[PDB]
Coordinates of C-alpha atoms and ligand atoms in Angstrom, one line a residue:
Chain A
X17 CA 18.9 20.3 -12.3
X18 CA 15.3 21.9 -13.4
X19 CA 16.9 21.3 -16.9
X20 CA 18.1 17.1 -16.4
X21 CA 14.3 16.8 -15.2
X22 CA 12.3 18.4 -18.5
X23 CA 14.9 16.7 -20.1
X24 CA 14.5 12.8 -18.5
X25 CA 10.5 13.5 -18.9
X26 CA 10.6 13.9 -22.2
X27 CA 12.1 11.2 -22.9
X28 CA 10.5 8.6 -21.2
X29 CA 7.2 10.3 -23.1
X30 CA 8.9 9.6 -26.1
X31 CA 9.7 6.2 -25.3
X32 CA 6.5 5.0 -23.5
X33 CA 5.0 6.2 -26.9
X34 CA 7.2 4.0 -28.7
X35 CA 6.5 0.8 -26.5
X36 CA 2.6 1.3 -26.0
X37 CA 0.1 0.7 -29.1
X38 CA -2.8 2.0 -27.5
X39 CA -1.9 5.2 -25.3
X40 CA -4.1 6.7 -22.7
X41 CA -5.0 9.8 -25.2
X42 CA -6.0 7.3 -27.7
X43 CA -8.3 5.1 -25.4
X44 CA -9.4 8.1 -23.4
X45 CA -10.6 9.5 -27.0
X46 CA -12.7 6.3 -28.4
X47 CA -14.1 5.7 -24.9
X48 CA -15.9 9.3 -25.4
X49 CA -16.9 8.9 -29.0
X50 CA -14.0 12.0 -30.1
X51 CA -12.6 12.3 -33.4
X52 CA -11.3 8.5 -34.3
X53 CA -14.4 8.1 -36.9
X54 CA -14.9 4.1 -36.1
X55 CA -16.9 3.1 -32.9
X56 CA -15.9 -0.1 -30.8
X57 CA -17.6 -3.4 -31.1
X58 CA -19.5 -3.8 -27.7
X59 CA -19.1 -6.7 -25.9
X60 CA -22.4 -6.7 -23.5
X61 CA -23.6 -10.2 -23.4
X62 CA -23.4 -13.8 -24.7
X63 CA -24.2 -13.3 -28.2
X64 CA -22.0 -10.4 -28.0
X65 CA -19.1 -11.4 -26.9
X66 CA -19.8 -14.8 -29.9
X67 CA -20.1 -12.2 -32.5
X68 CA -16.6 -10.7 -30.8
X69 CA -14.5 -13.7 -31.7
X70 CA -15.2 -12.9 -35.5
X71 CA -15.2 -9.6 -35.8
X72 CA -12.6 -8.3 -33.4
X73 CA -10.7 -11.8 -34.6
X74 CA -8.6 -10.9 -31.2
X75 CA -8.7 -14.8 -32.5
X76 CA -5.1 -14.8 -31.0
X77 CA -6.4 -16.5 -27.4
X78 CA -9.3 -17.5 -29.3
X79 CA -7.5 -20.4 -31.3
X80 CA -6.2 -22.9 -29.7
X81 CA -9.0 -25.3 -31.2
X82 CA -10.2 -27.4 -28.0
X83 CA -10.4 -25.6 -25.2
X84 CA -12.5 -23.2 -26.9
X85 CA -15.9 -23.8 -25.3
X86 CA -16.8 -22.3 -22.0
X87 CA -16.4 -18.0 -22.1
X88 CA -15.8 -17.4 -18.6
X89 CA -12.6 -19.8 -19.2
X90 CA -11.6 -18.3 -22.7
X91 CA -12.4 -15.1 -21.5
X92 CA -9.8 -15.2 -18.4
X93 CA -7.5 -17.2 -20.5
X94 CA -7.3 -14.1 -23.4
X95 CA -6.9 -11.6 -20.4
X96 CA -3.4 -13.7 -19.6
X97 CA -2.7 -13.8 -23.6
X98 CA -2.5 -10.1 -23.5
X99 CA -0.9 -9.5 -20.3
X100 CA 2.5 -11.6 -21.7
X101 CA 2.3 -9.1 -24.4
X102 CA 2.1 -6.2 -22.1
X103 CA 5.4 -7.5 -20.1
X104 CA 7.2 -7.5 -23.5
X105 CA 5.8 -4.1 -23.9
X106 CA 7.0 -3.0 -20.2
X107 CA 10.2 -5.1 -20.7
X108 CA 11.1 -2.9 -23.7
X109 CA 10.0 0.3 -22.1
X110 CA 12.1 -0.4 -18.9
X111 CA 15.6 -0.4 -21.2
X112 CA 15.1 3.1 -21.9
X113 CA 14.8 4.2 -18.8
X114 CA 18.1 6.0 -17.9
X115 CA 20.2 3.5 -16.0
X116 CA 18.3 0.6 -16.1
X117 CA 20.2 -1.7 -18.2
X118 CA 23.6 -0.6 -16.7
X119 CA 22.3 -2.5 -13.3
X120 CA 23.3 -6.3 -12.2
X121 CA 21.3 -8.3 -14.7
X122 CA 19.7 -10.1 -11.8
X123 CA 18.6 -7.2 -10.1
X124 CA 16.4 -6.1 -13.7
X125 CA 15.1 -9.3 -14.1
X126 CA 13.7 -8.7 -10.0
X127 CA 12.4 -5.4 -10.8
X128 CA 10.6 -7.0 -13.8
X129 CA 9.4 -9.5 -11.8
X130 CA 7.6 -7.4 -9.3
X131 CA 6.6 -4.8 -11.8
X132 CA 4.4 -5.5 -14.5
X133 CA 1.5 -6.0 -12.3
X134 CA 1.9 -3.2 -10.5
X135 CA 2.4 -1.5 -14.3
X136 CA -0.4 -3.5 -16.3
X137 CA -3.1 -2.6 -13.6
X138 CA -2.2 1.0 -14.0
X139 CA -2.3 1.3 -17.8
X140 CA -5.4 -0.8 -17.8
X141 CA -7.1 2.2 -15.9
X142 CA -6.6 4.0 -19.0
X143 CA -8.3 1.9 -20.8
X144 CA -11.2 1.5 -18.8
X145 CA -14.4 3.8 -17.4
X146 CA -16.7 3.3 -14.9
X147 CA -19.0 1.2 -17.6
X148 CA -16.1 -0.8 -19.3
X149 CA -13.2 -1.8 -20.5
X150 CA -11.5 -1.4 -23.7
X151 CA -10.3 -4.6 -25.1
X152 CA -8.3 -5.9 -28.5
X153 CA -6.2 -2.7 -29.1
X154 CA -9.0 -0.6 -28.7
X155 CA -11.5 -2.4 -31.4
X156 CA -13.8 -4.0 -28.6
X157 CA -15.0 -2.4 -25.5
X158 CA -16.8 -5.4 -22.7
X159 CA -19.1 -4.1 -20.5
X160 CA -18.5 -3.6 -16.5
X161 CA -21.7 -5.5 -15.7
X162 CA -20.9 -8.5 -18.2
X163 CA -17.8 -9.2 -16.3
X164 CA -19.3 -9.0 -12.8
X165 CA -21.7 -11.8 -14.4
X166 CA -19.2 -14.5 -14.7
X167 CA -19.5 -18.0 -13.2
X168 CA -17.2 -18.4 -10.4
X169 CA -14.3 -16.2 -9.0
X170 CA -14.6 -15.5 -12.4
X171 CA -16.5 -12.7 -11.7
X172 CA -15.0 -11.2 -8.9
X173 CA -11.6 -10.8 -10.6
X174 CA -12.4 -7.9 -13.0
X175 CA -14.8 -6.1 -9.9
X176 CA -11.9 -5.3 -7.7
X177 CA -9.9 -3.2 -10.8
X178 CA -12.9 -1.1 -12.1
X179 CA -13.2 0.2 -8.5
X180 CA -9.4 1.0 -8.9
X181 CA -9.8 2.4 -12.0
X182 CA -12.1 4.8 -11.2
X183 CA -10.0 6.2 -8.7
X184 CA -7.2 6.5 -10.3
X185 CA -8.6 8.1 -13.0
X186 CA -10.0 10.3 -10.7
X187 CA -6.8 12.1 -10.6
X188 CA -6.9 13.1 -14.7
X189 CA -3.1 11.9 -15.3
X190 CA -2.4 11.7 -18.8
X191 CA 0.6 10.1 -20.9
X192 CA 3.1 12.1 -19.9
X193 CA 2.4 11.9 -16.5
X194 CA 1.8 7.9 -16.0
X195 CA 5.4 7.5 -18.4
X196 CA 7.4 8.8 -15.5
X197 CA 4.8 7.4 -12.7
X198 CA 5.4 4.1 -14.3
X199 CA 9.1 4.0 -13.8
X200 CA 9.0 5.0 -10.5
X201 CA 7.2 1.9 -9.9
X202 CA 9.8 -0.1 -11.9
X203 CA 12.8 1.3 -9.6
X204 CA 10.9 -0.1 -6.8
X205 CA 14.0 -0.6 -4.6
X206 CA 11.9 -2.8 -2.1
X207 CA 11.8 -5.4 -4.4
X208 CA 12.4 -9.0 -2.8
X209 CA 15.7 -10.0 -3.5
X210 CA 17.3 -7.6 -5.2
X211 CA 21.5 -7.5 -4.5
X212 CA 22.4 -3.8 -5.4
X213 CA 19.8 -1.5 -3.9
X214 CA 21.7 2.3 -4.4
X215 CA 21.9 2.4 -7.8
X216 CA 18.0 1.5 -8.0
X217 CA 16.8 4.1 -5.3
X218 CA 19.6 6.7 -6.6
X219 CA 17.4 6.3 -9.6
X220 CA 14.0 6.5 -8.9
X221 CA 15.1 9.3 -6.8
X222 CA 16.0 11.0 -10.0
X223 CA 12.5 9.9 -11.5
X224 CA 10.6 11.1 -8.2
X225 CA 11.8 14.3 -9.0
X226 CA 11.1 14.6 -12.4
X227 CA 7.8 12.8 -11.8
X228 CA 7.3 15.8 -9.0
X229 CA 7.6 18.7 -11.8
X230 CA 5.9 17.1 -14.1
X231 CA 2.8 17.2 -11.8
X232 CA 3.3 21.1 -11.4
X233 CA 3.5 22.1 -14.5
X234 CA 1.0 20.0 -16.1
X235 CA -0.9 20.6 -12.9
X236 CA -0.5 24.0 -11.5
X237 CA -4.2 24.0 -10.6
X238 CA -4.6 20.7 -8.8
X239 CA -2.4 20.9 -5.3
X240 CA -0.6 17.9 -3.7
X241 CA -1.1 15.8 -7.0
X242 CA 2.3 14.0 -6.0
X243 CA 1.3 12.7 -2.9
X244 CA -2.0 11.4 -4.1
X245 CA 0.0 9.5 -7.0
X246 CA 2.0 8.2 -4.6
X247 CA -0.6 7.3 -2.3
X248 CA -3.0 5.4 -5.0
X249 CA 0.3 3.0 -5.0
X250 CA -1.0 1.4 -1.9
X251 CA -4.2 0.3 -3.9
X252 CA -2.0 -1.5 -6.4
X253 CA -0.2 -3.4 -4.2
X254 CA -3.4 -4.6 -2.2
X255 CA -4.7 -5.0 -5.6
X256 CA -2.0 -7.1 -7.2
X257 CA -1.7 -9.3 -4.0
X258 CA -5.3 -9.9 -4.0
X259 CA -5.6 -11.2 -8.2
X260 CA -3.0 -13.2 -7.1
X261 CA -5.5 -14.9 -4.6
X262 CA -8.0 -15.6 -7.1
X263 CA -5.4 -17.0 -9.4
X264 CA -4.7 -19.6 -6.4
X265 CA -8.7 -19.9 -6.1
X266 CA -9.3 -20.8 -9.8
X267 CA -6.4 -23.2 -9.5
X268 CA -9.6 -25.6 -8.9
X269 CA -10.8 -25.0 -12.8
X270 CA -10.1 -25.8 -16.1
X271 CA -10.6 -29.4 -15.0
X276 CA -1.8 -27.2 -23.9
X277 CA 0.7 -29.0 -22.1
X278 CA 2.6 -27.0 -23.7
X279 CA 0.6 -23.7 -23.1
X280 CA 0.5 -23.9 -19.6
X281 CA 4.6 -23.3 -20.1
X282 CA 3.8 -20.1 -21.6
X283 CA 2.2 -18.5 -18.7
Chain B
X13 CA 12.3 33.2 1.7
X14 CA 9.1 31.4 3.8
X15 CA 6.4 34.2 3.3
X16 CA 3.0 34.7 3.7
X17 CA 1.4 31.5 2.2
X18 CA 4.2 28.7 4.0
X19 CA 3.7 30.4 7.6
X20 CA 0.2 29.0 8.1
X21 CA 1.5 26.1 7.3
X22 CA 4.8 26.0 10.0
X23 CA 1.8 27.2 12.5
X24 CA -0.2 23.9 11.6
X25 CA 3.2 21.9 12.2
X26 CA 3.6 23.3 15.7
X27 CA 0.3 22.7 16.3
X28 CA -0.1 19.0 15.9
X29 CA 3.8 18.2 17.1
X30 CA 2.1 20.3 19.9
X31 CA -1.0 17.9 20.6
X32 CA 1.1 14.6 19.7
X33 CA 3.3 15.6 23.0
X34 CA 0.5 16.1 24.8
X35 CA -1.3 13.0 24.2
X36 CA 1.5 10.6 23.3
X37 CA 3.7 9.9 26.6
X38 CA 6.4 8.1 25.0
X39 CA 8.0 10.2 22.3
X40 CA 10.4 8.8 20.0
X41 CA 12.7 11.0 21.4
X42 CA 12.5 10.0 24.7
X43 CA 12.6 6.5 23.7
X44 CA 15.6 7.0 22.0
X45 CA 17.4 8.1 24.7
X46 CA 16.2 5.1 26.7
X47 CA 17.4 2.9 24.0
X48 CA 20.8 4.5 23.6
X49 CA 22.2 4.5 27.0
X50 CA 22.4 8.3 27.4
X51 CA 21.5 7.2 31.0
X52 CA 21.6 5.5 34.1
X53 CA 18.4 6.4 35.3
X54 CA 16.6 5.7 32.2
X55 CA 18.1 1.9 31.6
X56 CA 15.7 -1.0 31.2
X57 CA 14.9 -4.2 32.4
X58 CA 15.8 -6.8 29.8
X59 CA 13.6 -9.9 29.0
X60 CA 15.1 -12.8 26.5
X61 CA 13.8 -15.8 28.3
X62 CA 11.5 -17.4 31.1
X63 CA 14.0 -16.3 33.7
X64 CA 14.3 -12.4 33.1
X65 CA 10.5 -13.4 32.2
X66 CA 9.6 -14.2 35.8
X67 CA 12.0 -11.6 37.4
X68 CA 9.8 -9.1 34.7
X69 CA 6.9 -8.9 36.7
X70 CA 9.4 -9.1 40.1
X71 CA 11.6 -6.0 38.3
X72 CA 9.0 -3.8 36.4
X73 CA 5.6 -2.8 36.6
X74 CA 3.8 -4.1 34.0
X75 CA 2.3 -1.1 32.0
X76 CA 1.7 -4.3 30.1
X77 CA -0.9 -5.5 32.2
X78 CA -2.1 -8.7 31.1
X79 CA -5.6 -8.6 33.0
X80 CA -8.1 -11.7 32.7
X81 CA -7.1 -13.0 36.7
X82 CA -3.5 -11.2 37.0
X83 CA -1.8 -14.9 35.2
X84 CA -2.8 -17.6 33.2
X85 CA -0.8 -21.0 32.2
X86 CA 0.3 -19.6 28.6
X87 CA 3.1 -17.0 28.5
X88 CA 2.9 -16.2 24.5
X89 CA -0.5 -15.9 25.9
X90 CA -0.1 -13.6 28.6
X91 CA 2.2 -11.9 26.5
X92 CA -0.6 -11.5 23.9
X93 CA -3.2 -10.2 26.4
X94 CA -0.6 -7.3 27.4
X95 CA -0.2 -6.3 23.9
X96 CA -3.6 -6.3 23.8
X97 CA -4.5 -3.9 26.5
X98 CA -1.5 -1.6 25.4
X99 CA -2.8 -1.4 21.9
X100 CA -6.5 -0.4 23.6
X101 CA -4.7 2.7 25.2
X102 CA -2.8 3.5 21.8
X103 CA -6.3 3.5 20.2
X104 CA -7.3 5.7 23.2
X105 CA -4.3 8.3 22.9
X106 CA -4.4 8.3 19.1
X107 CA -8.3 9.3 19.7
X108 CA -7.3 11.8 21.8
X109 CA -4.7 13.1 19.1
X110 CA -7.0 13.1 16.4
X111 CA -9.6 15.4 17.9
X112 CA -7.0 18.1 17.7
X113 CA -6.9 17.7 14.3
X114 CA -8.2 21.1 12.6
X115 CA -11.7 20.1 11.0
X116 CA -11.5 16.5 11.9
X117 CA -14.4 16.7 14.8
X118 CA -16.1 19.2 12.4
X119 CA -17.0 16.4 9.9
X120 CA -19.8 13.9 10.2
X121 CA -19.5 11.6 12.9
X122 CA -20.1 8.6 11.0
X123 CA -16.9 9.3 9.2
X124 CA -14.6 10.7 12.1
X125 CA -15.2 6.8 13.3
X126 CA -14.1 4.7 10.4
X127 CA -11.1 7.2 9.9
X128 CA -10.2 5.9 13.4
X129 CA -11.5 2.6 12.4
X130 CA -9.1 1.8 9.5
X131 CA -6.6 4.3 10.6
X132 CA -5.4 3.1 14.4
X133 CA -3.8 0.3 13.1
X134 CA -2.1 1.7 10.9
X135 CA -0.6 4.5 13.4
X136 CA -0.1 1.8 16.2
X137 CA 2.4 0.7 14.1
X138 CA 4.1 3.9 13.0
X139 CA 4.6 4.4 16.4
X140 CA 5.7 1.3 17.4
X141 CA 8.4 1.7 15.2
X142 CA 9.6 4.6 17.6
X143 CA 10.4 1.8 20.5
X144 CA 12.2 -0.5 18.2
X145 CA 15.7 -1.3 17.1
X146 CA 16.8 -4.5 15.2
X147 CA 17.1 -6.4 18.4
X148 CA 13.8 -5.9 20.3
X149 CA 10.9 -3.1 21.7
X150 CA 10.7 -1.4 24.7
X151 CA 7.5 -2.5 27.1
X152 CA 5.9 -0.7 30.1
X153 CA 6.1 3.0 29.3
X154 CA 10.1 2.1 28.4
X155 CA 10.6 0.6 31.4
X156 CA 11.1 -2.8 29.8
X157 CA 12.4 -4.3 26.5
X158 CA 11.5 -7.6 25.2
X159 CA 14.3 -8.8 22.7
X160 CA 13.0 -10.1 18.9
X161 CA 14.0 -13.3 19.6
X162 CA 12.1 -14.1 22.5
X163 CA 9.4 -12.6 20.5
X164 CA 10.5 -14.8 17.5
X165 CA 10.3 -18.0 19.9
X166 CA 7.0 -17.9 22.2
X167 CA 5.1 -20.7 20.6
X168 CA 3.0 -21.6 17.2
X169 CA 0.9 -19.0 15.9
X170 CA 2.6 -16.1 18.8
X171 CA 5.9 -16.4 17.3
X172 CA 4.8 -14.8 14.3
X173 CA 2.9 -11.1 15.3
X174 CA 5.9 -9.2 15.6
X175 CA 8.4 -10.0 12.5
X176 CA 6.7 -8.3 10.3
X177 CA 6.6 -5.4 12.7
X178 CA 10.3 -5.8 13.1
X179 CA 10.7 -5.7 9.7
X180 CA 9.3 -2.5 8.4
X181 CA 10.8 -0.6 11.6
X182 CA 14.1 -1.5 10.6
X183 CA 13.0 -0.1 7.2
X184 CA 11.3 2.6 8.6
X185 CA 13.3 3.8 11.4
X186 CA 15.5 4.2 8.4
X187 CA 14.0 7.2 7.4
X188 CA 15.3 8.8 11.2
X189 CA 12.6 10.6 11.5
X190 CA 11.6 12.6 14.7
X191 CA 8.6 13.6 16.6
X192 CA 7.5 16.8 14.9
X193 CA 7.7 15.0 11.7
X194 CA 5.8 11.9 12.8
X195 CA 3.1 14.2 14.4
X196 CA 2.0 15.6 10.7
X197 CA 2.5 11.9 8.8
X198 CA 0.3 10.7 11.7
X199 CA -2.6 13.0 10.9
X200 CA -2.3 12.1 7.1
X201 CA -2.7 8.6 7.4
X202 CA -5.8 9.6 9.9
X203 CA -7.5 12.0 7.4
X204 CA -6.9 9.7 4.3
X205 CA -10.6 9.5 2.3
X206 CA -9.9 6.0 0.5
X207 CA -11.6 4.8 3.9
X208 CA -14.5 1.9 3.1
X209 CA -17.6 3.8 3.4
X210 CA -16.4 7.5 3.8
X211 CA -20.1 9.2 3.6
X212 CA -18.4 12.7 2.8
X213 CA -15.3 11.7 1.1
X214 CA -14.7 15.4 -0.3
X215 CA -14.1 17.3 3.1
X216 CA -11.7 14.5 4.6
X217 CA -9.5 15.3 1.2
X218 CA -9.2 19.1 1.8
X219 CA -8.1 18.2 5.3
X220 CA -5.4 16.4 4.3
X221 CA -4.5 18.3 1.4
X222 CA -3.2 20.7 4.0
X223 CA -2.0 18.0 6.2
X224 CA 0.3 16.6 3.4
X225 CA 1.5 20.1 2.3
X226 CA 2.3 20.8 6.2
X227 CA 4.5 17.3 6.1
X228 CA 6.1 18.7 2.5
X229 CA 7.3 21.9 4.4
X230 CA 8.4 20.3 7.7
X231 CA 10.2 17.5 6.0
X232 CA 12.1 20.0 3.6
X233 CA 12.8 22.2 6.2
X234 CA 13.8 19.5 8.8
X235 CA 16.0 17.3 6.2
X236 CA 17.4 19.6 4.1
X237 CA 19.9 16.6 3.0
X238 CA 17.2 14.7 2.4
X239 CA 16.4 13.9 -0.8
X240 CA 12.5 13.1 -1.7
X241 CA 12.1 12.1 2.3
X242 CA 8.4 13.5 1.2
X243 CA 8.1 10.9 -1.2
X244 CA 10.1 7.9 0.5
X245 CA 7.3 8.2 3.3
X246 CA 4.4 8.3 1.7
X247 CA 5.7 5.0 -0.4
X248 CA 5.9 3.6 3.4
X249 CA 2.4 3.8 3.5
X250 CA 1.8 0.6 1.8
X251 CA 4.2 -1.4 4.1
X252 CA 1.8 -0.2 6.9
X253 CA -1.3 -2.1 5.0
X254 CA 0.6 -5.1 4.6
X255 CA 1.3 -5.2 8.5
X256 CA -2.3 -4.3 9.3
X257 CA -3.9 -7.5 6.9
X258 CA -1.2 -9.6 7.7
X259 CA -2.1 -9.1 11.2
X260 CA -5.9 -9.8 10.9
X261 CA -5.1 -12.6 8.8
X262 CA -2.8 -13.3 12.0
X263 CA -5.8 -12.7 14.3
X264 CA -8.5 -14.7 12.7
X265 CA -6.4 -17.7 13.1
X266 CA -5.8 -17.0 16.6
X267 CA -9.6 -17.0 16.9
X268 CA -9.9 -20.7 16.3
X269 CA -6.4 -22.1 17.8
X270 CA -7.8 -20.5 20.9
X271 CA -11.1 -20.6 21.9
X272 CA -11.0 -19.3 25.7
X273 CA -8.8 -16.2 24.8
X274 CA -11.0 -12.8 25.2
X275 CA -10.3 -9.7 22.8
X276 CA -10.8 -6.3 23.4
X277 CA -14.5 -5.4 22.4
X278 CA -13.3 -2.2 20.9
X279 CA -10.2 -4.0 18.8
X280 CA -13.1 -6.0 17.5
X281 CA -15.0 -3.7 16.2
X282 CA -12.1 -2.2 14.1
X283 CA -11.6 -5.7 12.5
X284 CA -15.3 -6.1 12.4
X285 CA -15.5 -6.6 8.4
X286 CA -12.2 -4.7 8.2
Ligands
LIG301 C1 -6.5 -8.4 -18.1 C2 -6.3 -8.4 -19.9 C3 -5.1 -7.2 -20.0 C4 -4.4 -6.4 -19.8 C5 -2.9 -6.3 -19.7 C6 -2.6 -4.8 -20.7 C7 -3.4 -3.4 -20.2 C8 -2.9 -2.6 -20.8 C9 -3.0 -2.3 -22.2 C10 -2.3 -0.6 -22.4 C11 -2.4 -0.7 -23.7 C12 -5.5 -8.6 -17.3 C13 -5.2 -8.7 -15.9 O1 -6.0 -8.1 -15.5 C14 -4.3 -9.7 -14.8 C15 -3.2 -9.7 -15.7 C16 -1.6 -10.2 -15.3 C17 -2.1 -11.5 -14.1 C18 -2.6 -13.0 -14.9 C19 -0.8 -13.6 -15.0 C20 -0.4 -14.6 -16.0 O2 -1.4 -14.6 -16.6 O3 0.8 -15.2 -15.9
LIG302 C1 2.4 -5.3 20.2 C2 3.0 -5.8 21.3 C3 3.7 -5.6 22.2 C4 3.6 -4.4 23.0 C5 5.1 -3.3 22.4 C6 4.8 -2.3 23.9 C7 4.2 -2.1 24.9 C8 4.8 -0.9 25.4 C9 3.8 0.4 24.9 C10 4.7 1.3 25.7 C11 3.3 3.1 25.3 C12 1.4 -5.7 19.2 C13 0.5 -4.8 18.6 O1 0.0 -3.7 19.1 C14 -1.1 -5.6 18.2 C15 -2.1 -4.6 17.4 C16 -3.6 -4.2 17.6 C17 -4.3 -5.1 18.6 C18 -5.5 -5.5 18.2 C19 -5.7 -6.6 18.2 C20 -4.5 -7.4 17.3 O2 -4.6 -6.6 16.0 O3 -3.9 -8.1 17.9

């Protein structure tokens, strides 16, 4: 019992570290100033973004020459590109969750299709503070006020998440906590169209225990942390559906053929 | 065993289960008996169509009272005004319930109201779970029963108000919770702290902190074979939000299709910029 819980806890942690480049500990260190010795390039306005490209050579999303002429759009484009990377990082992590690869292939896909956003938002918080967000592997920091400062719906998107990031991080969880947490979200037995809910649930349950214990040791001081963390899941749901809203709101823009398919 | 510290938590539990019973006429226990047939005095008149809908008023005093001129021309509407007045009495009860929550009235008055503001529908739909089974829901304080099918037809929008409700009720009722559990859970929902505009959020959380602690011991004690019932119930809080919103969405649509339908004042300040 209290044996396995601490075993599965370390595994997930050890795995999460081996799947996510920029950890919560890292990103945290940076933002503050603490030992890393190489401050980030601050995108605070236009000339900053402009200079940013050729410095943080995040010239990944930036390239696709001829669709590189309108900040707000070239940014959101980039957000998506890195979002696709995350998904691969997540899917990989998923498969280290004890039992996950043993499920019906169909349900794995399903659990993943419905869990990446909630997971993306959760981790994103790790890289943002009340003032801004860490971009490009930690190299940059795009101020928060610059984001609200975007043309159309292009300036609403990031405002919510900031609002959500502030509360979430107010719980002061670290990578060892988040690792378990994230697996719980993945093993969500309510994802639409599943086929065999029992296994999933039997797994999430084992996960929920591991997490509850993880919280009591790593946080003796904080009462009912486990409960507060679970409630946050509601914030993710709302947040995610909402995001999926403007995604359709934005479908009145950008007005390559292969570019689209990749997304 | 349960020593010193835990002892205080059982009290809070009993204190609330007690206000709950005193605040709600139709507990879940009574609702179950009525629905499961362990009765020859508690059997409800079933409504699955106009036939019985007609004999509805001519068979059961309607605690589903549709007031605006006793009747109209639109049944679905007729139904809806009922579901409307009823909802109001619940907000009324729930409010009398909240007051009993240790500390709730010792908070700033503005905050008290915003807690109720957002907490009311979330609580209304939890309670509503108690009155439902896959085939329908009780009405007129148990005296009646409306089948899921009749509701699902009604009309254009109106045939879509209750489905999300039945959908969650089935999943929710599955936790097999009883009034004593619900009473603590209901208190947690009110004392959130993530409610829009709470002036002083902190004291609100010390309250929920204790309620959550109560709910955790209660569930432990009342369901020794329920692995992680605590967490599973907390997760159910999202389904609640979706229900609420998805409903408000629905409401606004009705606010145009039906230029003549009256919405209860109170019911309106709940949604006001909700
Ligand atoms: C913003 C950019 C990056 C977020 C991705 C990962 C952060 C975690 C890093 C930890 C090391 C993107 C979003 O906020 C929204 C994401 C997806 C929605 C778009 C869906 C699509 O493009 O198909
Ligand atoms: C209620 C639909 C039917 C009522 C069911 C049972 C009545 C018997 C109770 C015995 C104690 C649907 C809702 O309650 C609607 C919720 C809130 C109304 C506010 C305005 C709105 O959102 O429509």
